[PDB]
């Protein structure tokens, strides 16, 4: 998931918007 | 924007910085 | 409450969050 | 000690109360 | 003062704490 | 550089003053 992907690999801020309400 | 490696309480800050007024959900796997 | 892995300046924040008005002592081994 | 145990293993907030004044 | 190991967004805080009103430049290698 | 040295080894606050404006 994001927590794992941002912490095992890299993620972008665009991917982070997906978890905003 | 740049690709970030984020782990920890450091990440949820980026969740706030990204989100803000929308609020977020923080869902780790356990 | 949950069991936390804390290392660094990140920890002393939890010392403040836990303690607060009591104040704390921060004693590393060196 | 706490600094070492919270950083080599995991500790709980109850254990942290021990070092408040 | 003591010798610090600094990595990340944690470091730039020390850049602010050290510098402050002078401002700083943050130059990683990439 | 500083980012690398503070993150591969240790640096001191005196070394940090060098990058203030
Ligand atoms: Zn950290």
Residues E29 and C12: their CA atoms lie apart, in Å, by 30
Structure resolution in Å?
2.7
Whether C4 and D14 lie within 8 Å, measured CB to CB: no
CA distances (Å), E16 to each of A10, B13, B25, F17, in order?
Answer: 26, 18, 30, 10
Distance C8 CA to ligand 1 centre (A): 7
CA distances (Å), D11 to each of C27, D3, E29, in order?
Answer: 15, 9, 36
Structure tokens at B6: 């984020």
Instruction: For chain C, give every domain's residue range.
Output: 1-30
Residues F11 and B28: their CA atoms lie apart, in Å, by 34
A8: Cβ–Cβ under 8 A, 6 or more apart, which residues?
A: none
D12: Cβ–Cβ under 8 A, 6 or more apart, which residues?
A: C1, C2, C3, C4
The nearest alpha carbon in chain E to C9 belongs to E10
Residues F10 and A13: their CA atoms lie apart, in Å, by 30
E8: left (phi over 0), alpha (psi -120 to 50) or beta: left
Find where tokens 């990140």 sit. C10
Whether C4 and D12 lie within 8 Å, measured CB to CB: yes
Determine the distance from the C-alpha atom of residue E1 to the mean position of all C-alpha atoms in its chain, rounded to a whole number: 15
Distance of residue E30 Cα from the nearest chain B Cα, in angstroms: 12
Q: How many residues appear in chain F?
A: 21
């Amino acid at each position: 998931g994001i927590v794992e992907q941002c912490c095992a690999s890299v993620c972008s801020l665009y991917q982070l918007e997906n978890y905003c309400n | 924007f740049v690709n970030q490696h984020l782990c920890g309480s450091h990440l949820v800050e980026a969740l706030y910085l990204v989100c803000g007024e929308r609020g977020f959900f923080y869902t780790p796997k356990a």
